[PDB]
Amino acid sequence: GTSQWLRKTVDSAAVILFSKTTCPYCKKVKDVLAEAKIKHATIELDQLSNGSAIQKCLASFSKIETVPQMFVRGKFIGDSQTVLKYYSNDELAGIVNESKYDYDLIVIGGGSGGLAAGKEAAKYGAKTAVLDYVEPTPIGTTWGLGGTCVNVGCIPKKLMHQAGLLSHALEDAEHFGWSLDRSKISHNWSTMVEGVQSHIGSLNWGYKVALRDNQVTYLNAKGRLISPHEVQITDKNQKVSTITGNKIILATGERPKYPEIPGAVEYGITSDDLFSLPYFPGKTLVIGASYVALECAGFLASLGGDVTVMVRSILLRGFDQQMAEKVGDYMENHGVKFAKLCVPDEIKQLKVVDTENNKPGLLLVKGHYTDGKKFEEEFETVIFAVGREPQLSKVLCETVGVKLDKNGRVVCTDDEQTTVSNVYAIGDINAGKPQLTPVAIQAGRYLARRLFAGATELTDYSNVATTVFTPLEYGACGLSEEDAIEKYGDKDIEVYHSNFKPLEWTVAHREDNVCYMKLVCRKSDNMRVLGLHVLGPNAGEITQGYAVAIKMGATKADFDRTIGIHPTCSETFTTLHVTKKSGVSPIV
Amino acid sequence: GTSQWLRKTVDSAAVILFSKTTCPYCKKVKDVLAEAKIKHATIELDQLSNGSAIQKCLASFSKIETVPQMFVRGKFIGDSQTVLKYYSNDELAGIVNESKYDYDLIVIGGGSGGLAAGKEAAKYGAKTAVLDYVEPTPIGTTWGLGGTCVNVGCIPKKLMHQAGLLSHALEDAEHFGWSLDRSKISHNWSTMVEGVQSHIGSLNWGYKVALRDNQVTYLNAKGRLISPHEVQITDKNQKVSTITGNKIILATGERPKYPEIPGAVEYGITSDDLFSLPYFPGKTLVIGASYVALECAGFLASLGGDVTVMVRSILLRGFDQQMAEKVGDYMENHGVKFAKLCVPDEIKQLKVVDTENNKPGLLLVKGHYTDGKKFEEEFETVIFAVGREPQLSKVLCETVGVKLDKNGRVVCTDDEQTTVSNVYAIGDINAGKPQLTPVAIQAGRYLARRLFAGATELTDYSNVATTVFTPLEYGACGLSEEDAIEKYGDKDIEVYHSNFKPLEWTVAHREDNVCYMKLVCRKSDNMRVLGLHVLGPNAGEITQGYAVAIKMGATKADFDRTIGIHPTCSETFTTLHVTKKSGVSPIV
Numbered sequence A, B: 001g002t003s004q005w006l007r008k009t010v011d012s013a014a015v016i017l018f019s020k021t022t023c024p025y026c027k028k029v030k031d032v033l034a035e036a037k038i039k040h041a042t043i044e045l046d047q048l049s050n051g052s053a054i055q056k057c058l059a060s061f062s063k064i065e066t067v068p069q070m071f072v073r074g075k076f077i078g079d080s081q082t083v084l085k086y087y088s089n090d091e092l093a094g095i096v097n098e099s100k101y102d103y104d105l106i107v108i109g110g111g112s113g114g115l116a117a118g119k120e121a122a123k124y125g126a127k128t129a130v131l132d133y134v135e136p137t138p139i140g141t142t143w144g145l146g147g148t149c150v151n152v153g154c155i156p157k158k159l160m161h162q163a164g165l166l167s168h169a170l171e172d173a174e175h176f177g178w179s180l181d182r183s184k185i186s187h188n189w190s191t192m193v194e195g196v197q198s199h200i201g202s203l204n205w206g207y208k209v210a211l212r213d214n215q216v217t218y219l220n221a222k223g224r225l226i227s228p229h230e231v232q233i234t235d236k237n238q239k240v241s242t243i244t245g246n247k248i249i250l251a252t253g254e255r256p257k258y259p260e261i262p263g264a265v266e267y268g269i270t271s272d273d274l275f276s277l278p279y280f281p282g283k284t285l286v287i288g289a290s291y292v293a294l295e296c297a298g299f300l301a302s303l304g305g306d307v308t309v310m311v312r313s314i315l316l317r318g319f320d321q322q323m324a325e326k327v328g329d330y331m332e333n334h335g336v337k338f339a340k341l342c343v344p345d346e347i348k349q350l351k352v353v354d355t356e357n358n359k360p361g362l363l364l365v366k367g368h369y370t371d372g373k374k375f376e377e378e379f380e381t382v383i384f385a386v387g388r389e390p391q392l393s394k395v396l397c398e399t400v401g402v403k404l405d406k407n408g409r410v411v412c413t414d415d416e417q418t419t420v421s422n423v424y425a426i427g428d429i430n431a432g433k434p435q436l437t438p439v440a441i442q443a444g445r446y447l448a449r450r451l452f453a454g455a456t457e458l459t460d461y462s463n464v465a466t467t468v469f470t471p472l473e474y475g476a477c478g479l480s481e482e483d484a485i486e487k488y489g490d491k492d493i494e495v496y497h498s499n500f501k502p503l504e505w506t507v508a509h510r511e512d513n514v515c516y517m518k519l520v521c522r523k524s525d526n527m528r529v530l531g532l533h534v535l536g537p538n539a540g541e542i543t544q545g546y547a548v549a550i551k552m553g554a555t556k557a558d559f560d561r562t563i564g565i566h567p568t569c570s571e572t573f574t575t576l577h578v579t580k581k582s583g584v585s586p587i588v
Ligand SMILES: Cc1cc2nc3c(=O)[nH]c(=O)nc-3n(C[C@H](O)[C@H](O)[C@H](O)COP(=O)(O)OP(=O)(O)OC[C@H]3O[C@@H](n4cnc5c(N)ncnc54)[C@H](O)[C@@H]3O)c2cc1C
Pocket: A108, A109, A110, A111, A112, A113, A114, A131, A132, A133, A134, A135, A146, A147, A148, A149, A150, A152, A153, A154, A155, A157, A221, A222, A223, A224, A251, A252, A253, A254, A271, A292, A394, A395, A426, A427, A428, A429, A435, A436, A437, A438, A440, B565, B566, B567
């Protein structure tokens, strides 16, 4: 138990000190390591339940049972007299830098998870390199350090969402007494994109400074794992070379998919291209029905666009379908057109994009509805949002032995280990895990702590909350209503629900019974909250806090005994009483 | 014992049926009562764990042990055969209306708590009257049914806060690409007031409709308790008469104080007058430093007023003081002037309010600072927010025997009972309790269930969350940092904290390090979260959900293992790590 933990910790930590808070000999070693600029992990034995057992287990490695004890890459280095000796004799630097590999850690991929892992590992003295390269899109788009979220995901997505929310703010301002006239105000797309790209640029810069300040080596190069410890890198000048590392973290993420139809790659675009587009898309078709599809269609419409979404079958597959339908109806009532039960057959080019005058081209889209009727219509821009996929065939030689699943994602144990014992995987390519930036960050930081600082905490992937930033936002935590009924049966499930109206919407003359909330509960388990769902403004701020209560096992009774904050939207969760089985109306 | 529960339930219920869900005889009785339009409480014995015991004790009243058993105001009425006998003999209506008093319940006060209590009591067959009257302010302001929050509190306050928030939305919109020029836009006070008052008018009317549809008698009259069961009422036409009731609930609230100085009552106003003022206040002095004072000063500045606050000692006495200082510092940087350590001595009239042209008058304010120096300045409007107090002399005859404390508030047990066994008190006049609208509603609804439906649940008044709606809002749940240190000792307290910047502020070029949050925790109790604090946009939405987790006993480990929603402000709580004891900066 304790014995196997100690061996695992000593074997993979890069530099680690065993210590007690009250020991002046340990203080003297800490001071020497600080002065020499030697970073290391520290375990304070006097602060652990079984420090006594741990102190005795150290002797199986060092043949002594006192503190301090210094180790470098699995090897006992000395007590305080020995460490001081090495320091005085100018020998300490060379010992702590002695390694069988170029790096203690190589991270392949410089996104949300990889950056977080690399920075955390370096704080405990691991000699670390992070590799990042951005393969250009079909039309040539490329961007800087930071990954999908920073450059072409969460960050620019929510900034343009905000630009679209401000259009309703301008409308609302008239009713609250401001003198503007919403009817004579227009939006400039390229002004918005300049502002968004300037913030992304400051993040690109920020991460390069953060890696330099943590002594992480940053290589803007494509990586390929060719054996368990060898990473082949290719330059921006196509220079090829090989580096070695003790531990390897794969953190390379995904890229958008294209359907195999004529004209799709040549004439359409994806979200990768959209957030830095130099011209307003104009009349736009969005193909797909994921949260990416619906979020982009939504802000394009709020910014004055003529927008259609082409839906193969359902909206938001895998989310609660009653919530998904309310999301779609609101978008349709505020402008967005939907072509339902429809797929595309080809894209034809009527006009080439005008780089000179900064204007889109023109396309003819042909398709069919599931009953066989035909679809034919002209658009200026066609955005494909039909899923994302890893491309590990590039990153990973088949002979290394890292196992993939039928979608090409990496099969991992619950501590992120692959089938190759020194190789781990995090973020979107970890099979079966929620594909979200806070998950990738948590997994990468927690893993770095286990490898290099002796931590034991695992990442908990259950009941992770989400928010879809559609024009009216949708927050959720836990099971959908249909999944709860599937798992436990209808008679064991109670659902509490209510409509509501934000106070901010009253003077503004907005809709009475559009926002909506429900709790899905299990009768036989003290009416445990199995899932929470809210459609309304600031849905992500509303939901975040409740995700702690659900993690702790909240029941309906816990929600009833907590008091509301007034006036808020979130307080409605604390007074729910209408059940779906009663058949009583949920309106206000 | 189960028997003394059953006893109190039978004596206090107006009309109650003891039943079982599977018995078709109870079903015949239920339908008879439904058709004769008789409302009643129902206790389903085949759902409570000791229903067997209760069935036994019913015999102490009815001499039978079967089900159904119907009771009216403490008296057993019959089983299925007997209830049906009364029905087909036209005797049933007279038996259920037989009472010693005019009403089962008289509520004095038609505000947050009173209306909630009255409506809930009526759902169980209690014959209920709700009394309400609004004594005019010194200048004659009056308003309709609904209480302080609805008319001159939370509702109009938060609508004017939103009007102020929208001026920064107009500034922000330019950076997000919208073509408006903020510098050329002004605000119209009276247009805002008309929209705000039209919403308040729909609430006044909605409450009258709700009372009518619940068969609650509403009397717009001043009530006075002269003996335990007798309430004397006075007409709008000065007509005096007496009504009697079994149970009495006092829910009459508070009104603002004036300082005892020359000119205050004659020439100043308070919050009661502000929300329906027909002219813009103009250059305004707010005297006081409560949440009412800072909230009013804050939106007045955002709507374009010249605004000054005069502070006797500190801001937000009784709230966490590090947070109160950050609140005031934000306001001072955005155009609220403060006159610190200062009190007023007199108000001189220089110009009378111009009713015709819809213009304020002009006043001269004279005061002094704590050193000795003097204050003298003219203002168009002077608003007093120096506290609120009850006026129970008006409501309660001294001889009835209801004990008050030294502030004039009613001393109650933990079930809201006064020193007179049939008289209860709820809301702002219940001594010792948080003075908040959702607390009054929970107290009133829960009490009505105990009196008329055999409920046992009590209101929980601990760790009730709050939000102050200053220009930058401040949400809190639990202890301030100073209260926690004083209760447990500095060595047993750990504080995690961080600055943050909302994503929405990046393109808008707003401030990097003004928003702030912290968790105040107890080391020796598993790092239990004692208090949560957040300064930022949408702070009430952010805080509300964490209140459930704090109710359930959340620890720091619970916050750490929960995953954030990205991008939100609230997610910063899931990754806090900088302790105050460490000395490391909290900035970003
Ligand atoms: C449009 C959109 C919006 C989103 N919005 C949200 C949101 O609001 N909230 C949320 O939580 N999540 C959101 N997500 C999801 C979020 O972006 C991902 O979960 C996250 O970025 C995945 O992180 P990662 O570290 O796994 O991979 P990535 O962030 O994709 O980083 C992988 C990096 O490695 C690089 N790379 C690939 N192969 C190699 C190689 N061989 N050598 C070197 N480098 C390589 C890639 O080019 C990339 O830079 C959104 C995603 C999209 C597409």
